[PDB]
Ligand binder design. Sequence first.
Ligand SMILES: COc1ccc(S(=O)(=O)N(CC(C)C)C[C@@H](O)[C@H](Cc2ccccc2)NC(=O)O[C@H]2CO[C@H]3OCC[C@H]32)cc1
Lengths: 99, 99
Amino acid sequence: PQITLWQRPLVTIKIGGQLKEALLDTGADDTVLEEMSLPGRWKPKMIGGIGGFIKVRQYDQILIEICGHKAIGTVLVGPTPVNVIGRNLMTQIGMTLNF
Amino acid sequence: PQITLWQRPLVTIKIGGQLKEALLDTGADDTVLEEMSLPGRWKPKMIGGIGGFIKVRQYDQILIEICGHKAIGTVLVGPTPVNVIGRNLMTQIGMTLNF
Ligand SMILES: COc1ccc(S(=O)(=O)N(CC(C)C)C[C@@H](O)[C@H](Cc2ccccc2)NC(=O)O[C@H]2CO[C@H]3OCC[C@H]32)cc1
């Protein structure tokens, strides 16, 4: 389907048994979510955007479910003010920008 | 045209008669550009990014061409890692997310 940009493109994802609302963000290289517990090992990382950098924990090979599609990708967990689904995951569901 | 998300959706924009590279950002409500000169008066605006809030200069009804398409709207100037084209301008050029 087609998703208009008149409003923030929000979606609900399924990750680690939890349901979280997130923003389909083409400007985000990776998916970034607010603090939560995830299984597996992680690496510390610093990501920057408007307002500066925040420290996050990088988890790779995490199973996520969006709109019925089951995809695997990297999830950065940290003090982000808003949950965003990055390009890392959007490519997996075949999402593109069109005009 | 269709833009996949394997790489950053960087495009060429024209503003003030100059060509610049900008990122198509669906997670951004507004368009935020790196320091540059724009005509007329500006108003203050407080925007919150991943790293916190910053003060930017708001210029309205500015002509800006994105991927060859003519737009006339609000452009915010301030400290940002890269020129960001937000939903305010993407809607003007008929851009949408598809999958
Ligand atoms: C490595 O992985 C990364 C993932 C995400 C980011 S990032 O979040 O700083 N970024 C990147 C953008 C600022 C270049 C995504 C932007 O779309 C970012 C996502 C976001 C963060 C906090 C609150 C709302 C929206 N949007 C953003 O800064 O938008 C600015 C400009 O328009 C306004 O909309 C609300 C916030 C304002 C950085 C790195």
